[PDB]
Design an enzyme around this catalytic site. Structure first.
Site, PDB file in Angstrom:
ATOM      1  N   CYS A 244       1.197  -1.190  -0.669  1.00  0.00           N
ATOM      2  CA  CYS A 244      -0.212   0.156  -0.046  1.00  0.00           C
ATOM      3  C   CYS A 244       1.063   1.428   0.170  1.00  0.00           C
ATOM      4  O   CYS A 244       1.279   1.820  -1.173  1.00  0.00           O
ATOM      5  CB  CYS A 244      -1.140   0.123   1.063  1.00  0.00           C
ATOM      6  SG  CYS A 244      -2.285  -1.434   0.914  1.00  0.00           S
ATOM      7  N   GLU A 273     -10.862   1.294   5.474  1.00  0.00           N
ATOM      8  CA  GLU A 273      -9.734   0.474   5.960  1.00  0.00           C
ATOM      9  C   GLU A 273      -9.396  -0.900   5.939  1.00  0.00           C
ATOM     10  O   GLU A 273     -10.876  -1.450   6.005  1.00  0.00           O
ATOM     11  CB  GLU A 273      -9.076   0.754   7.905  1.00  0.00           C
ATOM     12  CG  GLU A 273      -8.672  -0.810   8.157  1.00  0.00           C
ATOM     13  CD  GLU A 273      -6.824  -0.327   7.981  1.00  0.00           C
ATOM     14  OE1 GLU A 273      -6.478   1.066   7.990  1.00  0.00           O
ATOM     15  OE2 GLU A 273      -6.420  -0.847   7.719  1.00  0.00           O
ATOM     16  N   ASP A 313     -14.027  -8.695  -0.542  1.00  0.00           N
ATOM     17  CA  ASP A 313     -13.836  -6.932  -0.115  1.00  0.00           C
ATOM     18  C   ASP A 313     -15.894  -6.850   0.195  1.00  0.00           C
ATOM     19  O   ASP A 313     -16.763  -7.037  -1.116  1.00  0.00           O
ATOM     20  CB  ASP A 313     -13.428  -6.729  -1.460  1.00  0.00           C
ATOM     21  CG  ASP A 313     -12.790  -5.366  -1.655  1.00  0.00           C
ATOM     22  OD1 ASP A 313     -13.757  -4.092  -1.551  1.00  0.00           O
ATOM     23  OD2 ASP A 313     -11.073  -5.141  -2.931  1.00  0.00           O
ATOM     24  N   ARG A 315     -15.543  -2.973  -0.452  1.00  0.00           N
ATOM     25  CA  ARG A 315     -14.183  -1.845  -0.538  1.00  0.00           C
ATOM     26  C   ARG A 315     -16.149  -0.789  -1.911  1.00  0.00           C
ATOM     27  O   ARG A 315     -16.326   0.558  -1.671  1.00  0.00           O
ATOM     28  CB  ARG A 315     -13.766  -1.400  -1.218  1.00  0.00           C
ATOM     29  CG  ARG A 315     -12.788  -1.807   0.008  1.00  0.00           C
ATOM     30  CD  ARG A 315     -11.257  -1.198  -0.277  1.00  0.00           C
ATOM     31  NE  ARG A 315     -10.578  -2.463  -1.661  1.00  0.00           N
ATOM     32  CZ  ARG A 315      -9.895  -2.313  -2.289  1.00  0.00           C
ATOM     33  NH1 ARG A 315      -8.828  -1.466  -2.335  1.00  0.00           N
ATOM     34  NH2 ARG A 315      -8.906  -3.870  -2.234  1.00  0.00           N
ATOM     35  N   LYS A 342     -11.624  -1.229  -9.500  1.00  0.00           N
ATOM     36  CA  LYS A 342     -11.224   0.630  -9.581  1.00  0.00           C
ATOM     37  C   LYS A 342     -11.472   0.930 -11.540  1.00  0.00           C
ATOM     38  O   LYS A 342     -12.152   1.406 -11.705  1.00  0.00           O
ATOM     39  CB  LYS A 342     -10.141   0.965  -8.912  1.00  0.00           C
ATOM     40  CG  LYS A 342     -10.115   0.318  -7.509  1.00  0.00           C
ATOM     41  CD  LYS A 342      -8.463   1.595  -6.964  1.00  0.00           C
ATOM     42  CE  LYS A 342      -7.972   0.927  -5.619  1.00  0.00           C
ATOM     43  NZ  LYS A 342      -7.111   1.452  -4.653  1.00  0.00           N
TER      44      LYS A 342
HETATM   45 ZN    ZN Z   1      -1.549  -2.734   2.771  1.00  0.00          ZN
END
Ligand code: ZN
Ligand code: ZN
Lengths: 401, 397
Positions: A244, A273, A313, A315, A342
């Site tokens: 990241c 997060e 996931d 997100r 994305k």
């Molecule tokens: Zn990370």
């Protein structure tokens, strides 16, 4: 006396601020509230503690003097395109200007967006200078390593009918499930169908702009961009289990260079997060990865999250491009990201992507090989070959302790 | 089936305390207000609404248990000592195994794992000869070996009210009112004592042996750091945050190397718990005000926007220290008088206060640190007087 005025209507996506109506999410006058929830994300809980302890008056209203944006962002046509921006308030940075009359009429209206300037000094950028990857120019990058940026904090404002469409479910079902799965947070989700706007108690995002914000709305100016989802254990603490902070700071380097060459750069930092599972779930999964029979292998990486969380996931990148449309972005010349989720969301929302910039192999931290190999095998962009089954079965994860 | 298990906060055994059941798979088992994972329950709802996640899903906790045994300690069962986290929240699979098997869907609110953390400032400390890799705590690569624990909030409302010197009834009414009516059970279910708020928690980084935190004979170096994304991640030179964080990390590594133990708690309280929008509005007002960005106006600029200077309420901050068994902090790498008063007021001796070295103050952070020192933050040297505080120390724009 008289009943004063009622709550102002909201017409989401209207062509002007006056027709759209202000988001009134304060609590100084309950009769003026025209949304579900309150401002500042999770920090409404701390505001409540401040009122309960007597430190803060429940009557306090912000003095917005001198707080207006340092940079004019919009308005742009996207701000009034149906269903285009559904998870932030496009007018949220300029309420003092565009709702001056409503403020003067007694509606207590808070900004949900703030725009300021900063000098950001990242050690990786200082090292980039030392290594000759970057060269101070005195305008975008100083010899100290400082990069001049515009930054905008954006707090969430959800138009529930539009959010429902974004997820291909009915608004009634979205609202019932929000109510049920939070343990009954905000019964107005199910008792006030007339309220269309929801201010959830979640983190928002921060956009860092390298160059002139107005150029984001000009596809003739080369835009370098990354949308980064929060990872505290790397973004702050540099854990070598994931990619990241390396990808974030590589993107920042590329944005500085893009601005120096006459373009514009953008990094969005979104508060999600642990794939929006939170950090406890994230750490539980790390433990299971390291203890599983056969060791920490890329072929089990996603399975380990699924067993704990029930999904890989949460997100939901389907809402992620809203900030890009808010900024007027129609084209990303260099997308410093690999995620197919994305990329699909960005291009699916009408934003052209030209060059996809993968994370250089030399920047993968020592215990992040499992992660990046699993992601490439799962469909993340890579210019070369995808790891095959045999490669993914290698025990590339470090043992615990 | 079976009803909701009772909770007896502060009880001396897990069995008597009872599990926090904050899941929604069986409404009849819920014994708290709210749900797990802080703000991220909202994303769980989207996952259910979109069909990605079954509303019936329960975690498989196999192999997730803590890498390091933390407690139990006496503080876990001292009345009113720990009111904002669940002391048993890391060990639910162990201590509530019978309840899990009986069908109560119990989630951990704490997770404990290990990491190698590699910070550029620590690598530079090595290159400059301030730090020397030893092979156990600090590697030649710059990696520091840590235990880290993520702690999500679990509030015992009667205990929180006491901590804030107000009645539980008033605390719960104000929580309900000032959130726009979040969780009416705050006012309609006085029998529910525990609240899982949709706020961020904290993360503890332990350098050395977690068990040594509970032994006041082992030198403890510690910092409680409140989140500042714009510095902690992005290095903005308007504030001292990442410099103080990474200085503390350096000092924790050295403390462990000398035979002690180190602790950094990273608490999710962005912008003095006002959030980042308010923080940025205040930056703008600071830079535009008549007379420039001066330390004597620093707090006034926040007050004008927010109505208070700070909403972090450090009175709940020492709970994590008590959870870890901490009774003494030999080196507190912090200056705040509010943090110091809260820690020492909870009975924890602080021996040495370690201020931020002057050479680490970033180029536009002088207004901040001067205002804080004038406000009573610890410093060994001179406190800026009125004349010094009136200097235009803040950069334009
Ligand atoms: Zn990370
Ligand atoms: Zn800061």
């Amino acid at each position: 006396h008289s009943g004063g005025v009622g709550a102002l209507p909201i017409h989401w996506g209207a062509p002007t601020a006056s027709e759209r109506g202000p988001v009134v999410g304060t609590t100084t006058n309950r009769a003026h509230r025209n949304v579900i929830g309150t401002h500042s994300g999770s920090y409404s809980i701390y505001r409540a503690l401040a009122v309960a302890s007597g430190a803060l008056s429940r009557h306090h209203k912000a003095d917005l003097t001198d707080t207006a944006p340092t940079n004019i962002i919009g308005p742009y046509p996207q701000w009034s395109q149906p269903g285009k921006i559904v998870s932030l308030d496009p007018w949220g940075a300029t309420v003092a200007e565009v709702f001056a009359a409503e403020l003067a009429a007694g509606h207590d209206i808070r900004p949900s967006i703030a725009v300021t300037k900063a000098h950001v000094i990242l050690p990786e950028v200082m090292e980039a200078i030392q290594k000759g990857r970057l060269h101070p120019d005195g305008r975008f990058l100083l010899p100290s390593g400082a990069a001049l940026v515009t930054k905008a904090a954006i707090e969430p404002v959800w138009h529930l009918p539009g959010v429902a469409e974004r997820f291909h479910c009915s608004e009634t079902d979205l609202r019932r499930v929000l109510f049920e799965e939070t343990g009954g947070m905000y019964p107005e989700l199910v008792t006030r169908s007339d309220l269309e706007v929801f201010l959830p108690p979640i983190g928002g995002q921060t956009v860092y702009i390298f160059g002139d914000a107005r150029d984001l709305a000009d596809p003739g100016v080369e835009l370098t961009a990354r949308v980064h989802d929060e990872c505290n254990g790397s973004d702050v603490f540099g854990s070598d289990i994931c990619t990241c902070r390396p990808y974030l700071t590589h993107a920042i380097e590329e944005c500085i260079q893009g601005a120096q060459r006459g373009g514009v750069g953008l990094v969005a930092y979104s508060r999600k997060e642990g794939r929006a599972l939170g950090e406890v779930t994230k750490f539980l999964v790390y433990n299971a990865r390291k203890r599983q029979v056969g060791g920490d292998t890329a072929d089990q990486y996603f399975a380990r999250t699924e067993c704990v969380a029930g999904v890989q996931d949460m997100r939901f990148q389907e809402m992620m491009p809203d900030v890009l449309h808010w900024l007027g972005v129609r084209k990303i010349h260099r997308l410093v990201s690999m995620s197919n989720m994305k990329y699909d969301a960005i291009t699916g929302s009408g934003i052209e992507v030209v060059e996809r910039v993968d994370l250089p192999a030399d920047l993968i931290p020592a215990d992040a090989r499992v992660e990046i190999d699993a992601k490439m095998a799962a469909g993340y962009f890579t210019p070369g070959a995808v790891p095959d089954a045999d490669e993914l079965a290698k025990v590339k994860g470090r043992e615990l302790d």
